Amino acid sequence: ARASVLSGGELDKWEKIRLRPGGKKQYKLKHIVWASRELERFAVNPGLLETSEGCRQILGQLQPSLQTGSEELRSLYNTIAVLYCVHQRIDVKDTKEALDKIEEEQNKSKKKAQQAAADTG
Amino acid sequence: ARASVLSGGELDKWEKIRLRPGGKKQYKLKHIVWASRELERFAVNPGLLETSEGCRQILGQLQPSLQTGSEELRSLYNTIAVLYCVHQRIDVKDTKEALDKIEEEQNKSKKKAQQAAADTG
Amino acid sequence: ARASVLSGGELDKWEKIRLRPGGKKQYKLKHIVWASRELERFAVNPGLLETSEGCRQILGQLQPSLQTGSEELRSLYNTIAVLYCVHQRIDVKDTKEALDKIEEEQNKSKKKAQQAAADTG
Ligand SMILES: O=P(O)(O)O[C@H]1[C@H](OP(=O)(O)O)[C@H](OP(=O)(O)O)[C@@H](OP(=O)(O)O)[C@@H](OP(=O)(O)O)[C@H]1OP(=O)(O)O
Ligand SMILES: O=P(O)(O)O[C@H]1[C@H](OP(=O)(O)O)[C@H](OP(=O)(O)O)[C@@H](OP(=O)(O)O)[C@@H](OP(=O)(O)O)[C@H]1OP(=O)(O)O
Ligand SMILES: O=P(O)(O)O[C@H]1[C@H](OP(=O)(O)O)[C@H](OP(=O)(O)O)[C@@H](OP(=O)(O)O)[C@@H](OP(=O)(O)O)[C@H]1OP(=O)(O)O
């Protein structure tokens, strides 16, 4: 799943985002196929990774087994978290820098989703 | 797992259920055998399929992973939804007519259950 | 995982516990490594087996898939339920005595955890 989830542009910053913040050589194509083929190992439609919404619901489905899940499953969840921010063309140097973006997004949605329920009236 | 889930009679209608409405192929023995070696893979006791209730909750167990599930997870959930209707001896032409059965059945119970609740009172 | 999950002390009572209450075969070391290799297969972090809290959550993570789970999952859940009491140095004869009192543990907290709710104020 190389030419299906990362276009010519999104595939540049991906290989530029190093695995861990205080770490060297960045993400690679083996991770997208690893995450994709790992998604069938856990029975989750890999096609959702192609969109900016499938990667968002996959994270939700993965959060249940977050604090007790395995370590490689954490890498799977982390890789998708980056791909999510990747599809949005966000500024991200390493992995941890992206999850805080997602961690920042949760409140933003609630800060604005709840800003809509009260916006009426 | 062939002489246990579907009896000689219940298997009669099973062999006729078309896999797809706009298709011709109908169910077979492998579709329940494959289903057998699919829930054990996903840590689910297959014996539940034998009963008319062991299939009404396996689907409830798979509904969470349905909207984001893989392809075989969909076909797996398909085979059980039909087996439930079979254990009810309900006349279902193809897969779709059975898929709507459960959804047409959810409100059915809830309609009279809630009514039965309000009926007491 | 043989020299990490259970210390020299708690590694003895495990050897004393027989598989079934009215049975003979007792627990061994292949049940912890097997349980370790299994939760690994289930995207579960094995390290939590080494603490009195790492297994309290694994049980909760497995409680949902209990009523419809497989038998080797039935055995896997039973293994951690026993080693949990092992990490508590509780006196349990067989696998059932621990299971019976594991469900004897939630309400006791709620018994006085809800007490503190009214004890405060
Ligand atoms: O490792 P280097 O070849 O010395 O250059 C790296 C990095 O290289 P890669 O990300 O491709 O591995 C960037 O990419 P290149 O220009 O070398 O292709 C480069 O410049 P860009 O980031 O603009 O692409 C620069 O990063 P930056 O310019 O943001 O500082 C950074 O140089 P350092 O080795 O000094 O970190
Ligand atoms: O006596 P009914 O008005 O016919 O209701 C009874 C029953 O009543 P009691 O158990 O209190 O005698 C339950 O009462 P409510 O829930 O409506 O208050 C009700 O629902 P539940 O049992 O789910 O609580 C349902 O029982 P069941 O759902 O098991 O069939 C059953 O109503 P029906 O006699 O119409 O079936
Ligand atoms: O099997 P036995 O050698 O006959 O002894 C067993 C048991 O041994 P197991 O670990 O093999 O089950 C205990 O330990 P050991 O005799 O092997 O040292 C022993 O004493 P402890 O339980 O205090 O260790 C006692 O168990 P209990 O007194 O709780 O019944 C019980 O003896 P019997 O099976 O012969 O009654």
What angle (nearest 5°) sits at the alpha carbon of residue A100, between those of residues A97 and A102?
Answer: 115
CB contact under 8 A, A42 and C40: no
Q: How far apart are CA C95 and CA B109, in angstroms?
A: 39
Backbone φ and ψ of B90, nearest 5°: -80, 145
Q: In the 8-state DSSP scheme, what is residue C65?
A: T
List the resolution, Å: 3.3
CA dihedral angle for residue B10, residue B15, residue B17, residue B22, rounded to 10 degrees: 180
Helix (H, G, I), strand (E, B) or coil at B18: strand
Q: How far apart are CA C49 and CA C35, in angstroms?
A: 9
What residues in B contact C71, CB-CB < 8 Å?
Answer: 45
What residues in B contact A45, CB-CB < 8 Å?
Answer: 68-71
Chain B contacts in chain C segment 76-105 (CB below 8 A): none
- Neighbouring C-beta atoms of residue B43, cutoff 10 Å: 20
Identify whether the C-beta of residue A22 lies closer than 8 Å to the C-beta of residue A8.
Answer: no
Helix, strand counts (H, E) of chain C: 6, 0
Backbone φ and ψ of B101, nearest 5°: -55, -50
CB contact under 8 A, A65 and C48: no
Q: CA distances (Å), B82 to each of A16, B21, B32, B50, in order?
A: 49, 13, 10, 12
Chains touching chain C through at least 3 C-beta pairs below 8 angstroms are A, B
| Residue B71, ligand 2, Cβ within 6 A | no
Measured on CA atoms in the order A47, A52, A55, A58, is the torsion positive or negative? negative
Q: Cα A58 to chain center, whole Å? A: 9
CB contact under 8 A, A45 and B72: no
Query: Which residues of C does the annotation place in the binding site?
Result: 16, 26
Q: Strand runs (DSSP E) across B2-119, as ranges? A: none
Ligand 2, atom 9, residue with closest C-alpha = B120
| Residue B117, ligand 2, Cβ within 6 A | yes
Backbone φ and ψ of A26, nearest 5°: -80, -170
Helix (H, G, I), strand (E, B) or coil at C68: coil
Q: CA distances (Å), B75 to each of A55, B51, B58, B92, C86, in order?
A: 22, 20, 14, 17, 42
The domain ranges of chain C are 1-121
Closest alpha carbon to A5 in A61, A51, A37: A51
Residue C22: which residues within 8 A CB-CB, separation 6 or more? Answer: none
Ligand 2 atom index nearest CA of B119 = 3
Helix (H, G, I), strand (E, B) or coil at B26: strand
Q: How was this structure determined?
A: X-ray
- Cβ pairs bridging A and C (under 8 Å): 23
Q: How far apart are CA C48 and CA C42, in angstroms?
A: 14
